[model samples]
Target chain A: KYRVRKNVLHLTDTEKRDFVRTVLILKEKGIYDRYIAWHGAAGKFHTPPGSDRNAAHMSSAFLPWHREYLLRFERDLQSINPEVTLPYWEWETDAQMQDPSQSQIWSADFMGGNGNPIKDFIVDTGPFAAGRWTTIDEQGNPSGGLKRNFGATKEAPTLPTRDDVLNALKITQYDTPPWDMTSQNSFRNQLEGFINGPQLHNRVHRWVGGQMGVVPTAPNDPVFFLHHANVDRIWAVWQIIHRNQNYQPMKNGPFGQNFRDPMYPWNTTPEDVMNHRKLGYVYDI
Target chain B: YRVRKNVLHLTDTEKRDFVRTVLILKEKGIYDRYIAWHGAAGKFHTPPGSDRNAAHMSSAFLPWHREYLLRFERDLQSINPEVTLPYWEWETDAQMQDPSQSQIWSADFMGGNGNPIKDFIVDTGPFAAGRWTTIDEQGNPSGGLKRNFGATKEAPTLPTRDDVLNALKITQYDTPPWDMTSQNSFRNQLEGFINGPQLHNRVHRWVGGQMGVVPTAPNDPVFFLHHANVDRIWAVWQIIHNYQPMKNGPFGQNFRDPMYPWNTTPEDVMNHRKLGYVYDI
Candidate 1:
């Protein structure tokens, strides 16, 4: 839909180059292969051997895992090239017709395809939307989709054109377009709402059922890029809205103590978290 | 680096085992260096460093004990690859105080410009250049190495723009560090350092003495190596017995006087001296 819209603009030129390379390296190192079998969230990526949709979600679709992974990708980029920003892709608006069969340009495993994604077709989710939503519901449950954020439970999401993606990318504000949690998008603002605004920014994605597998043949499967783009974008956005937000979870909260704990996923270290202040984010968007 | 819940529970035999390396490093003056570098000095540069070197560290734990534990684990692995770093999760005990966690300031706080020297070149400004402190010829803070001295010196000449860029060691077609504002940093940072010398060799994650809170951070495991070398330098500094006169870099109070950091009070940083995490070295 957006031929060269700003949404696809690789905000940081160096990052655009790095994103492709990192993803390639991640694939090269089989990064996700380990966690795919241990996903404990809400998708198919880490399903308990005999678990159902809930297991399916933990295995595959758990939103936070990918979010963390994308950031991990960001970490990798910093390790390789400290000055380059991570490049992101927006896929929601164009999600309907993106089939991997149409392209063979992935950075690493572009040649390998489990199946022809182009021929089979992938269903659409709010996989990539540019702007954030303003929730209008005060009465909605914490995990419920109807929760409203962005000032009011009443203000709906303002659908952004490719230009907005560009604007956000220009500044690296990934969470600009809050998904309309009330509207049934696949990437429900599930986690955002659960933590912050329950008061500051309220929006949660209702984890719907179903495991949509990847069959894209195009090495440059837009789905891969778009999903990651959205992932990268949301993390930036979350920081903007909640980087210093108060009353965030403490060590003993429901979440466990370290990365190895089932409660928390990333294998972060004190040293890794130490530089967020110096590794500063560019929120040009 | 896998962190254990109870370091206090370390057995007598295990403690004796580490004494050998500890003694080696200690005899090399690592203990005294630990007392000096990690001791009364080496704390986070409060006004926060802008370039990649004087970077701000992010914390996910709240006075959070577990968080620092992960970092400590990394600290051990880098020093002794054979042993695992244990986590002294401050949160497990209600007795643990906040402010700067149970750990006290050991002077060995700031990572030189502390930014990941590789991939991330952050422009973390929004900083206020408060009353700058003058440095002694050796670069040690003219203020108290152990106490919070209330003297304010003017800012010394910071790193030249050229030096910082060169120090980064990026080899590709060189441009200004902030030129594009955004670049494919992922690939640039990795490829740029991958085949290089000592610094880049530490990038791989998930093997041997390596540890990460999340499966993602490649630098987290190498973090120990980064600090290990840093600690090594201090050890080297002592052998030469080069007092404050020979050291080269700038050193000052973690923050400036009049406490310009937003909403923060002097009492905020003074805790560096009083905090509970005493040096175990």
Candidate 2:
């Protein structure tokens, strides 16, 4: 029952077309923007009745929470096309190059080239280019479409190097409590790149600028899924290396919960979801 | 009108008094209560309005943080008059090949790195992790004051003394688009953005753990002193340049703008001497 997920750059033309079709279909069903809003609001951990534990990115929940999110998103796509699987963009591979935008991944056939010179960072080419998918900003205000600044001139062109990933992989612990961005020596912190493990995830977001750089509007761009898929794969790899390790707070303290702790919207806890095999797929790492 | 001392030069007994007094403040709930000055969703016991955030990250960053540290200093003083916040200079740590090996991070001081098994659970130092419980950026009660003294391998060395001198040579207090990207602006430079291989944000990155993340950084007691160093630098710049009242920044957010939670503007904070204190650099 396991389906193998391939890298975006390695996907066959047919697989790419099917993946795109599934995405477009999901967008038509409003699932694309649905997730964009969910994540956008979550960052405003300052809002609502207030419980910081649920913020997907900031806490110990970051890894499993995103695992759940990506799985849920994949399920939505599968509902559209039974054969479709999310393909990850191995960004570290591109990071080794001099100009990332020059890679085939950014070709007109893929994510397209740099943004137009102005406030609008609308990706000017590619299948998912401007006007193709209308989205909203983090404030939930409607925008014309998804946007990007593809290593634009306003900021330094950068990405997490292969060395960054290597450094992150060396961090052994999964996470420690108070498990937000400040968690140290933990893989979660290293992977989040807050403890400066090669600036893995956030640097890519900041480097892309525009919608990608912004928290709320980031998911509006389809590449967000690809990016997260790679992040998920990294987690999976880490799990493979440390088979004995379990999800923390490990059932004590302020933010702690055990293996059976329910992560809302799905009955599964971090423990229930650890095995990628049970999730019905694994990355082709 | 002044007496701000370098933390590195503080006596061992003075250090113990400072650390013990901060622990007392934490025990008294004063530490957690005033932390909302940066403003969460509704946790602001100090004041309201999003603009009130002390780390303005723009041209007003220097004065705003200076005002913030002053208010926080007074808070600490209310408990013990002789106690002024002691700052950990990043240059000293940056010079070390292994920052955790530094004495400033010794158990007598800010404490050392996180334990490898449960690192976010800091196990050493005066401010060892969880000695003071944390509030997440969103105002949720969390655990521990975490640290990973030199986890960022990329930033192998911290800003040198020369770098600070170079920053001082820049003339303008700040320029337009006063946000993090504003270049050639002394405020931007010292703030660690735009010509920033120097102070402020870079130190946070260099610190690696609770200090690195923006929202809950204050949960660590070191935040005050680290910020004190920044305030001290601003004072030095003001003295050398003989300039005050940083301007041309976005209206309602610049030098003349009414800084939040206080009845003053950046003009009120232009001179450290006017604020009843001066750095003993």
Candidate 3:
């Protein structure tokens, strides 16, 4: 019952069109707005041990929670087109290029070119350009369209290399205590790339800048799903190398609880989300 | 493994309980892990394949030390049923301009920093000069515990609340190449390096002497209190993040897999409640 998720660059022309059409269909129905609102709701709450903000964005559950979130979103996509699949962007191929911003994926034919610098960094081209997309905040208030700025800053110096992937793959622990950004050599921390080492996920967001740089609003950009699909792809690849090891079995505290706890708004835990196969989808390299 | 309370908040009676238990464990040669971890006899990382240095700075750090501390804590209970491990929160001292001047460095607690003239030999506290002997120290014989607080002239001061706050911001629990060199990791940050000189390494370097040295840190009983506190911070961060035990990463040599000597999974170690222990503060 698992669907095949392939790379955006690898999809056939017809397949890519179907995918784009399905996304537009969902956007028209306002499912994308609802998804961003769920993420926004998480940011508004601060009840962890030390009263930290946004459990979904700033803790160990970042992976599994999102895994579940995107799965739900994918289910919505399936409702529109059974043949439609999420495509991943293997940014590393672009990372190897001198100017990542110049990749064809940025053309108007696809995700579109850079944002209009004078007009709030809005995407000017592409099927999901600024004029066509409108976001809904946590309060159900309507807002502006999507935004992006591919590789304009020194912050996102380059994309991750194969070496970076290998380095991240070597970490054995899922997480350590203080299971956030400071967890030493934890695989989750490495991928999140907050403080140091093979910072994959955060870099892409920064590379795109604008809305992607902002939490709760990042998913407003259609590229968010593509970028995360690749992040998710990397997880699957790493699992292949490490025999699918996982942990965080018990609650560390009210704020620092682990895998078995309900991931807000969803009746699921890491136990259910951990297996992509069970969730009915697997990435095709 | 009970919630290791901050030593600063410990009742005078609890402080006495900690000291009594630590003294007993010291006399029993339980600090050998530190000696082995540092490859005192050149057995750990010298050839890079030996298993002697099995302590922190890796994926095994959390659970390996958890098991190690529990064994030490159990020994303490054996000597005195009322005694439990007490943690030393070093962040307060981190806030001070001269952490070496803090009260915890006194002879009454961990004794003052190492002696400058005698190879930085510690001359204060019950574990002071000539009072305790570190065995198998990088293949060296028994010797006095050593320290040199704030001697790293180059690194930043101890990690502050902000340092930990930044660490807490990281969401993914870990990634691959799951060792001390692993990057962009909360685990690595707590261990130090990458975005560090932040947490663990900062503490070791600040202490100097044997604590600064890789293999003989545990020769000084304060290592236990220090690690216990680090362990407590892990618990607190877990509470803050609402993280659960979900396993992924390296298989054989990492956390979810069997650890050396103890063979417990990171999952097992994460179960503090089932372990019948909880942090007091």
lDDT of 3 by residue, A130-238 (tens): 6776654333345666677776667776677777777887888776767766678787778877757326888888888777877757877788888888887787777
Distance from true position, residue A241, model 1, in Å?
4.0
Q: What digit string (tens of lDDT, one per residue) describes model 1 on residues B1-281? A: 13222334556444444333443433332222222211111122211232211111111001111223223443444577554433232213223342122221111221112113322221121110121111121213232111111111221121122322343443332122311121322112221232231111221111111121112121122233333322222222223331110112221212221111111322232221133221222
Sorted into a CAPRI-style docking class, model 3 comes out as incorrect
Q: Residue-wise lDDT of candidate 3 within B189-270, one digit each (tens)?
A: 7777665566877887777767776656666777777788777777766775622124444332344554433336666777
CA displacement after TM-score superposition, residue B7 of candidate 2 (Å): 62
Ranking by TM-score: 2, 3, 1
Q: Comparing 1 and 2 by TM-score, which wins?
A: 2
Winner by lDDT: 2
Q: What's the CA error at residue B216 for candidate 3, in Å?
A: 54
Candidate order by decreasing DockQ:
2, 1, 3
Residue B211 CA displacement from its true place in model 3, Å: 54
The DockQ-derived docking category for candidate 1 is incorrect
